[PDB]
């Protein structure tokens, strides 16, 4: 009898622990593997896939398709703000239900570079330009285009090619950021300003629409798995 001493932590059941256990059905025979297209080895390969962003949450439109559409209309003056939303991919209502939004909510910490892909769905003849700005925190969301200039902005132009890519770089004083809302690490702001008013021929429709996309670059990473507040329950399902 090899002498031995139990240590604190015996006869406990830990949720995340790693241990070996005796099999309940010895020498069971396993069916062979098959080659199934689309094998995921890691969740990060989901986080790089594009997804639509319900940029317009206003009012009761969240029950219709119009939640995904951004109105763009010819004005009589330039410098009006197209839209804007805060960057809090796990908290802010914008990204909340997105694809990237779901995967984050399981994780507490993250860092990387979020790409925003925009695509102009308007009429083929109408053209236009736009100013996509990103203002790091330290001041409120800029309320005038002249103020949006001093951020990091990509002047983007409609034309033969359609899609655009605004790559939000990674600027923070820490390595990671809370996915849950906190004022300490708060992310920043994003705006879109008319660079030059939409020009439309005659007989072509005045108003257009612009859809937004979200993806994570190849430097993206997450940490510290947790529960997701979204899904509810009452009593066991039947």
């Amino acid at each position: 009898g090899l002498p031995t001493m139990n240590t604190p932590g015996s006869c406990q059941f830990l949720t995340s622990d790693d241990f070996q256990s005796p099999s309940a059905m010895p020498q069971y025979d396993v069916t062979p593997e098959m080659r199934i297209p689309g094998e995921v080895k890691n969740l990060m390969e989901i986080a790089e896939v594009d997804s639509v962003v319900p940029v317009q949450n206003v009012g009761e439109k969240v029950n219709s398709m119009e939640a995904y559409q951004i109105p763009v209309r010819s004005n009589e003056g330039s410098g009006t703000q197209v839209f804007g939303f805060p960057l809090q991919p796990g908290y802010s209502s914008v990204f909340s239900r997105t694809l990237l939004g779901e995967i984050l909510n399981y994780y507490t910490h993250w860092s990387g570079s979020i790409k925003l892909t925009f695509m102009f769905c308007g009429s083929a003849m109408a053209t236009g330009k736009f100013l996509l700005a990103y203002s790091p925190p330290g001041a409120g969301a800029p309320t005038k285009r002249v103020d949006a200039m001093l951020g990091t902005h990509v002047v983007w132009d409609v034309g033969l090619q359609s899609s655009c890519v605004l790559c939000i770089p990674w600027i923070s004083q820490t390595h990671y950021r809370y996915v849950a809302s906190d004022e300490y690490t708060a992310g920043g702001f994003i705006t879109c300003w008319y660079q030059t008013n939409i020009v439309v021929p005659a007989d072509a429709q005045s108003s257009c629409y612009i859809m937004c996309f979200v993806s994570a670059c190849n430097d993206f990473s997450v940490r510290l798995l947790k529960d997701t507040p979204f899904i509810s329950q009452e009593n066991f399902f039947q």
């Binding site: 139990n6 240590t7 604190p8 932590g9 015996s10 006869c11 406990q12 059941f13 830990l14 949720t15 995340s16 796990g90 908290y91 399981y106 507490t108 910490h109 925190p137 330290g138 001041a139 820490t174 390595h175 990671y176 950021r177 809370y178 996915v179 849950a180 809302s181 906190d182 004022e183 300490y184 690490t185 510290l224 798995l225 947790k226 529960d227 997701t228 507040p229 509810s232 329950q233 009452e234």
Partner: protein
């Protein structure tokens, strides 16, 4: 690791002056006792081991405890994680501005009967559950709420009579180290909460009974114990003087520098 040797010295007459220096340079003189007197060659086998940081910060300590019962108003106990709600641990970490280490948690749970007139009370072995909730997660408002399923959140099931449970946690901070002292606000307008309270969001810790366990009421007691490991430190500082007051801030009540004594010449304390 070993103490340095004290090298012997004979008499001296010379213009080199070890015994003099200038402290205005902010430079502690390195003079060793062999300089100002005659000294015999002596080997010291004393070791500085037990003074290392590791042995200094690593001891288990009781940070906090709660009470939750088997019936009535309070059926579970909730606590946010801060070291600062216990005096003697918090002081040991206030030497060092920036600390880095890996917690090792140990819980100690006990049960106590409560006075009641209930008849034919017959105990059964109770089972305690301890659930950790990283920040922002769902918060149970009732014992039977769905959140206790712990589809993810690390949770521990424990039983009376067994050994106390233990689990180790790695370094959870965002930055390159925990911060004991933080001067600044949480808001760019220099408003809102001031002090270290802003940096600290560790999530929350919960506990409950799994089963009623008997007819008669039962109150339980849980205790948390930190045991830092693999410690690293930076930028030491003066120990705290005045008694603590609040756990969210450094606020203190002004108190004297030391104790007192009689006239300067007096050689004994009073």
């Amino acid at each position: 690791g070993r103490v340095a040797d004290t090298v012997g010295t004979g008499p001296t007459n010379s213009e080199a002056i070890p015994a003099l220096t200038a402290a205005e340079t902010g430079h502690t003189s390195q003079v060793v006792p062999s300089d100002t007197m005659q000294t015999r060659h002596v080997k010291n086998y004393h070791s500085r081991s037990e003074s290392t940081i590791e042995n200094f910060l690593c001891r288990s300590a009781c940070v906090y405890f709660t009470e939750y019962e088997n019936s009535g108003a309070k059926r579970y106990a909730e606590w946010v994680i801060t070291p600062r709600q216990a005096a003697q641990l918090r002081r040991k970490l206030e030497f060092f501005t920036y600390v880095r280490f890996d917690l090792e948690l140990t819980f100690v749970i006990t049960s106590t009967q409560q006075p009641s007139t209930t008849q034919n009370q017959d105990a059964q072995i109770l089972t305690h559950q301890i659930m950790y909730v990283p920040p922002g997660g769902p918060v149970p408002d009732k014992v039977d709420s769905y959140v206790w399923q712990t589809s993810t959140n690390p949770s521990v099931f424990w039983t009376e009579g067994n050994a106390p449970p233990r689990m180790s946690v790695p370094f959870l901070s965002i930055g390159n180290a925990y911060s004991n002292f933080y001067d600044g606000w949480s808001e760019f307008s220099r408003n809102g909460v001031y002090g270290i309270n802003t940096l600290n969001n560790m999530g929350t810790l919960y506990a409950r009974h799994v089963n009623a366990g008997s007819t008669g009421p039962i109150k339980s007691t849980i205790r948390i114990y930190f045991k830092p490991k693999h410690v690293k430190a930076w930028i030491p500082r003066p120990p705290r003087l005045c008694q603590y007051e609040k756990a969210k801030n450094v606020n203190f009540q002004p108190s004297g520098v030391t104790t007192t004594r009689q006239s300067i010449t007096t050689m004994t304390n009073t």
